[PDB]
Amino acid sequence: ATKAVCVLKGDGPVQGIINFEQKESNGPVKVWGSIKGLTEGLHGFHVHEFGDNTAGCTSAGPHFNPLSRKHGGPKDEERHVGDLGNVTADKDGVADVSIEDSVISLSGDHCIIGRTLVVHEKADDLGKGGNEESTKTGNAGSRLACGVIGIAQ
Amino acid sequence: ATKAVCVLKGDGPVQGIINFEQKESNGPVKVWGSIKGLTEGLHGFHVHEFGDNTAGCTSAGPHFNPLSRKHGGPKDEERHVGDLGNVTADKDGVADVSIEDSVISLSGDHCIIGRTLVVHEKADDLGKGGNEESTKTGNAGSRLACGVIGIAQ
Ligand SMILES: [Cu+2]
Ligand SMILES: [Cu+2]
Ligand SMILES: [Zn+2]
Ligand SMILES: [Zn+2]
């Protein structure tokens, strides 16, 4: 148990304290929080498996996969158990996050604690992008800020 | 087949890498690292509970302590959970390290991923040096750098 945390940052001039609150056994991770500095538009907003912030945002791994799926948006069943959404930066990029996914957990299985959350640079192609580079990531270019999903209070 | 990593970043010159290997359900745990630019001879090497690092090292609270024991000795009977003691920063303060301790297991009940490991500024005195203080936090002084234990490579 309890309320995860994650504060994103990297060579990107962007950043963000992002929160995670999840009650009843398994089931709906409530994620809300904010992230500044960035360039308006959509941004991919994933989970990367390895919580190695070892050497940047390279180490995080590809998207969290338990039995290897291709990509998806949150709304599908074709999706990795790591890829949450796309997130919008409006002007002067307060990309105010709100989300309520049912796949990613906080205690058992789809264990994201000590995993990484990456907010990306290009706009998420969400599957629907008819190339293999989307099924791989969803085409969202850099890893601009990242951090380990640790444990707040 | 658990693994873990921790990039011990602080905002003094102090920049570290440190990991936890440990198997076969109740195989002890290991730490091997490279602590850096740390003041000679003896430093605090703890693991504080909430892997909240919002405000860097200080939101990580008390040592990982499920039990409500007093301060830990590297090996006391009555040791925090989170204090693993001291480390030796060979002259120029590189601290090549190694621990094998019973207590800092990461799976079947009691796992510490999603927590912080903070390396303390001064010479950590075991607690038993009776003072409800030295017993708080082993008379260690600042937290000069931290990192979150997550699943690694
Ligand atoms: Cu991604
Ligand atoms: Cu401490
Ligand atoms: Zn994906
Ligand atoms: Zn302690």
Tell me whether residue B80 is annotated as binding.
yes
How many domains would you assign to chain A?
1
Q: How was this structure determined?
A: X-ray
Q: What is the DSSP letter of A92?
A: G
Question: A59 CB near a chain B CB, below 8 Å?
Answer: yes
Distances (CA, A) of A111 to A138, B60, B108, B116: 22, 20, 14, 17
Of A5, A50, A150, the CB nearest to B151: A50
Ligand 1 centroid–CA A15 distance in Å is 16
How does DSSP assign A44-81, residue by residue?
Answer: EEEEES----TTTTTTT-SB--SS------SSSSSS-S
**Nearest-5° Cα angle at B42, B41 to B47:** 145
| Structural domain of B74 | 1-153
Q: This structure's resolution (angstroms)?
A: 2.4
Write the CATH number for A58.
Answer: 2.60.40.200
- Indicate yes or no: CB of A114 within 8 angstroms of CB of B114: yes
Judge whether A21 is closer than 8 Å to chain B, CB to CB: no
